[PDB]
Design a protein around this ligand. Structure first.
Ligand SMILES: OC[C@H]1O[C@H](O[C@@H]2[C@H](O)[C@@H](O)O[C@H](CO)[C@H]2O)[C@@H](O)[C@@H](O)[C@@H]1O
Ligand SMILES: OC[C@H]1O[C@H](O[C@@H]2[C@H](O)[C@@H](O)O[C@H](CO)[C@H]2O)[C@@H](O)[C@@H](O)[C@@H]1O
Ligand SMILES: OC[C@H]1O[C@H](O[C@@H]2[C@H](O)[C@@H](O)O[C@H](CO)[C@H]2O)[C@@H](O)[C@@H](O)[C@@H]1O
Ligand SMILES: OC[C@H]1O[C@H](O)[C@@H](O)[C@@H](O)[C@@H]1O
Ligand SMILES: [Ca+2]
Ligand SMILES: [Ca+2]
Ligand SMILES: [Ca+2]
Ligand SMILES: [Ca+2]
Ligand SMILES: [Ca+2]
Ligand SMILES: [Ca+2]
Ligand SMILES: [Ca+2]
Ligand SMILES: [Ca+2]
Lengths: 114, 114, 114, 114
């Protein structure tokens, strides 16, 4: 299945936060309605935050996360969870190698804000 | 039901990250086996990160999140989600008032690291 | 927090299924847009299915689950999970006594159908 | 990523339930510790239950779901959710064709029982 794609409510603010856990330098691309709106880059094996931004989901509400290491696409896993019928998390893990820890770049999307 | 309490595997590194979305100044306490090991305080209506740390779950693996505003306990909601049978997220929302957005402090715990 | 309340897309067919794991006879009340549309009743300590129905979410999309045992309200816990940005589960556990297993009646709501 | 594989606690009773939403006849295979312990075969476009059983997770706790239609493997998506630090759901969707509804066979695994 395609992973890392989420439909948000339109024209809504969301937070996006990326964490690194790999020897490889991670590149996280955030696409909103098929246009790049953020790129995060960094390296850590200790969960460093390599980016955190507030973005808007625009008309279509389509948010897509892509992760690459030195231009090679990582394999993604994802899900959305809603708490109290209001608080939303869109969650992405990514795997750059063989150990299947899926934490090499971790991306958390949250909404609503404010 | 009690919320904000999670059993992690023992002696395991995990990340904890807190975001604020409220007029009220948020205090997030992180307890590991009933000892307060991190405290984050801050105010934002725009999802600012008010704390991020790497901790160890210790022998019992018990991680508890408590949130207060001006000394009053916020109401909590929480769940754990596991992706690819390996990547864990323990998620907490909190409500300090009446609107039931549950985002007033948001806490994300992730493991494994590295 | 209020639990057992979910917003579905409008005018959508969904499934609701209840399981029992308790000495007590469970009564599961299902409301769509604040009107009762189903009642499931049954007793099992071995996960028997006590009801399964297909319903429509109507104009408002509001679905609420309440659980009681001999007229006493059970404590509820809930969350919604979305897989592949399409497949929805709304999940309820309930606690009728003191052991905090939250499985006394378990309700699974799924959509889309067909 | 591999999907449909879950680690349960050892020697634990769990429920497995399958629903069908497809023109195609679904075959759901359930393995516990790499041995087939149930096969559900059925057809519905309206969320009928095509199997429900109580099984034991054995020493290894490994539960795997596979879904096929006329011998061809469906694409799987999955996740595990824990409520109240106690109530577990392991969730599977499957896609047998091209519409990406992921509901063609839906499998819900729940524990604890009793
Ligand atoms: O005070 C907690 C509260 O802050 C934010 O809401 C604001 C306050 O209620 C107050 O300043 O009134 C404002 C409207 O005039 C309102 O925006 C929200 O983040 C709310 O969720 C939070 O609980
Ligand atoms: O009574 C509801 C309760 O039922 C099941 O526990 C049982 C009861 O407490 C009573 O029948 O005593 C039995 C032996 O002590 C006990 O198993 C459980 O399903 C429990 O979760 C439920 O709340
Ligand atoms: O065949 C699997 C498919 O079944 C259901 O879609 C139907 C079939 O494509 C076929 O019978 O044509 C029908 C009308 O065109 C169509 O509804 C769906 O459940 C689909 O999700 C599933 O993959
Ligand atoms: O290939 C990079 C590699 O670096 C580290 O060894 C680990 O974090 C692995 O999970 C990661 O995949
Ligand atoms: Ca890895
Ligand atoms: Ca890693
Ligand atoms: Ca609030
Ligand atoms: Ca708020
Ligand atoms: Ca109970
Ligand atoms: Ca019980
Ligand atoms: Ca399909
Ligand atoms: Ca289908």
């Amino acid at each position: 299945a395609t992973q890392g794609v989420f439909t948000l409510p339109a024209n809504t603010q969301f937070g996006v936060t990326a964490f690194a856990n790999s020897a490889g330098t991670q590149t996280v691309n955030v696409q909103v309605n098929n246009e790049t709106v953020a790129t995060f880059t960094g390296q850590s094996t200790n969960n460093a935050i390599i980016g955190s931004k507030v973005l808007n989901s625009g008309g279509g509400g389509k948010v897509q996360i892509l992760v690459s290491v030195n231009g090679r696409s990582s394999d993604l896993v994802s899900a959305q969870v809603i708490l109290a019928n209001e608080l939303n998390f869109a969650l992405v893990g990514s795997e750059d190698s063989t150990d299947n820890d899926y934490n090499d770049a971790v991306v958390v999307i949250n909404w609503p804000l404010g």
